[PDB]
Ligand binder design. Structure first.
Ligand SMILES: Nc1ncnc2c1ncn2[C@@H]1O[C@H](COP(=O)(O)OP(=O)(O)O)[C@@H](O)[C@H]1O
Ligand SMILES: [Cl-]
Ligand SMILES: [Cl-]
Ligand SMILES: [Cl-]
Ligand SMILES: [Cl-]
Ligand SMILES: [Cl-]
Ligand SMILES: [Cl-]
Ligand SMILES: [Cl-]
Ligand SMILES: [Mg+2]
Lengths: 359, 35
């Protein structure tokens, strides 16, 4: 890390960095105009301007620990999808204190998140227009179909981790700091995922869960977009399960068995469910409620797969050849599916790819 | 998490609390409508 001042007097940072994709050959990377854009207990997120191209980038600086167990760099080097934020470069750096080593992820910059836009609408006592709910959820389910095809489970699906370009309506999944390639028979830590979005089998302590925990989290995101606030606001891990049961009713013995078989014998109090049509506002579109009911299932194998979710009738308007964004410009890329993306259910492409986009 | 026997007891206790709150809620409706 060397530093220079160019014309206009800005502070220029120059490093040697490895490309996120392609051959392992380090290159000089120079950027300027750095400012703090995000925060964590173990790092910082910056915006910067690449000197050669002038493009805005994001730099995620994550403190390195031996016991940290972070698969983020390894996963990001492998991923290449229009709904996942691209790793341009990565490099290591040292902080001001001794033995303070940081991994630096130079990412494509995206100006907003689904959380901030939803909060902005919520603060104005308004709901996000349904076309954006369809567009955002569709692209999220698309990105989950991609990573799940590699066995990779995000494990932290939430609105803050959904990057958003409001001009184009493009969504990009980010924050792979909890992501893992799930291997059958190898246990996974059950205290994972942010509390409001945490699947019930995780709260039950299941270590043999699958990538369907992301679909539960996506259901929470969709419900939050319809409601204007989180649907399951737990005060704690056990309270989170209580908040879920307050809406969905007490899980049956067979649903408990599918979440964690160690609990099948317990007689839990029968909490009457709220009907789905009473959970949301009266004018909430009925297909949004229906799709949400197929994501927020206790039994994980009963949840829709991300490819099935993309084919749900709630997204039919996206497949209409006349569909366009409300501002006037046409929708982002939606039907350029790859073989890797469709590998879970290859026959579904005849539904996911309408004739006008097959052309 | 933890021992399932311990977690199930805590969950049962909290869910019983939910039932009591909901039952008290409807009784409060009846008391208010009686006024
Ligand atoms: N590529 C990016 N472009 C623009 N902003 C980003 C990017 N990556 C992250 N951010 C912002 O910084 C926040 C934190 O980064 P993220 O890796 O998602 O989670 P964490 O806080 O755990 O690092 C995100 O919620 C987002 O608001
Ligand atoms: Cl956050
Ligand atoms: Cl496997
Ligand atoms: Cl049995
Ligand atoms: Cl009961
Ligand atoms: Cl259910
Ligand atoms: Cl205790
Ligand atoms: Cl009243
Ligand atoms: Mg995050």
């Amino acid at each position: 890390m060397k530093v220079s001042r160019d014309k206009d007097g800005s502070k220029v940072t120059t490093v040697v960095a490895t490309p996120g994709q392609g051959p392992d050959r380090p290159q000089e990377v120079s950027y300027t105009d750095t400012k703090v854009i995000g925060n964590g207990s173990f790092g910082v997120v910056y915006q910067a301007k690449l000197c050669d191209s002038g493009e805005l980038v994001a730099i995620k600086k994550v403190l390195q620990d031996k016991r940290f167990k972070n698969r983020e760099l390894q996963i990001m080097r492998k991923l290449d999808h229009c709904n996942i934020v691209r790793l341009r470069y990565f490099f290591y750096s040292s902080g001001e204190k001794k033995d303070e080593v940081y991994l630096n992820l130079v990412l494509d910059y995206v100006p907003e998140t689904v959380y901030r836009v939803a909060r902005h609408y919520s603060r104005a006592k308004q709901t996000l227009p349904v076309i954006y709910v369809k567009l955002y959820m569709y692209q999220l389910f698309r990105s989950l179909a991609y990573i799940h095809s590699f066995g990779i489970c995000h494990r932290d699906i939430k609105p803050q981790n959904l990057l958003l370009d409001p001009d184009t309506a493009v969504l990009k999944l980010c924050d792979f700091g909890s992501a893992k390639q799930l291997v059958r028979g190898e246990p996974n830590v059950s205290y994972i995922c942010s509390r409001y979005y945490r699947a019930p089998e995780l709260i039950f302590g299941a270590t043999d869960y699958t990538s369907s925990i992301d679909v539960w989290s996506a259901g929470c995101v969709l419900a939050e977009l319809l409601l204007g606030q989180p649907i399951f606001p737990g005060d704690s891990g056990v309270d989170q399960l209580v908040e879920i049961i307050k809406v969905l009713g007490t899980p049956t013995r067979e649903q408990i068995r599918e979440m964690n078989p160690n609990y099948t014998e317990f007689k839990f109090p029968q909490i009457k469910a709220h009907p789905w049509t009473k959970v949301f506002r009266p004018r909430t579109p009925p297909e949004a409620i229906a799709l949400c009911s197929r994501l927020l299932e206790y039994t994980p194998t009963a949840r829709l797969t991300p490819l099935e979710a993309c084919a749900h009738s709630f997204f039919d308007e996206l497949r209409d050849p006349n569909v366009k964004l409300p501002n006037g410009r046409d929708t982002p890329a939606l039907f350029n599916f790859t073989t890797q993306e469709l590998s879970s259910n290859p026959p579904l492409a005849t539904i996911l790819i309408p004739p006008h986009a097959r052309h | 998490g933890v021992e399932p026997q311990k977690f199930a007891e805590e969950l049962i206790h909290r869910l019983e609390a939910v039932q009591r709150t909901r039952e008290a809620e409807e009784k409060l409706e009846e008391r208010l409508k009686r006024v």
